[PDB]
């Protein structure tokens, strides 16, 4: 409950209570957890994905 990720926290347990909460509070998700990053099809923010590559022109 003391967690800043609605997409996490609903991939764990009691997903409908945590969805009702996140919905009646307008709770915003930053897509920084591994779960929130695998739900919307992003690259996790640890290990190999932690930096850019920035090909110079």
């Amino acid at each position: 409950r003391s967690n800043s990720s609605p997409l996490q926290q609903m991939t764990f347990e009691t997903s409908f209570q945590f969805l009702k909460q996140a919905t009646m509070l307008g709770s915003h998700d930053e897509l920084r957890s591994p779960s929130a990053c695998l739900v919307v099809g992003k690259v996790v923010r640890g290990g190999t994905g932690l930096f850019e590559l920035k090909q110079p022109l």
Binding site: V43, G49, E52, L53, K54, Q55, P56, L57
Partner: protein, 157 residues
Amino acid sequence: SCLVAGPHQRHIALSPRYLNRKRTGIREQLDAELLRYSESLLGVPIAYDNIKVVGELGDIYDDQGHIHLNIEADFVIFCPEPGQKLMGIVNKVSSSHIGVHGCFNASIPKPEQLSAEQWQTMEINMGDELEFEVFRLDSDAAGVFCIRGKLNITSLQ
């Protein structure tokens, strides 16, 4: 005068094949694919890109191989727009229509002339029986921009 210059920012994704040769590749297909083809974002025939530069760096995005970047380009454009009385080449006289510079095609649907002037099949005579088959009044305000070969519907009233 159709003289126009528009500075616009575009997004271009360059292949890794055009790394050593970018200016070559920034145009090969990604800019030379709408060469003086009607634009709907700004109403623009893209004559040619005078200069295509990038402000700084390029961002390769994770699994994707392409290099995405920004191109600040001035489109030199010829804008015949509503509020102008243009000219047109008279080549073939038809009841359906009356089909500049040999490359701008113009149209004139039937009920767009003065109805005082009556037509003959071989050639048409206007009010004072003066035959005019030459660059003259053509004021286009209804413009097609969809069909592959677009139109320029000209008016005289």
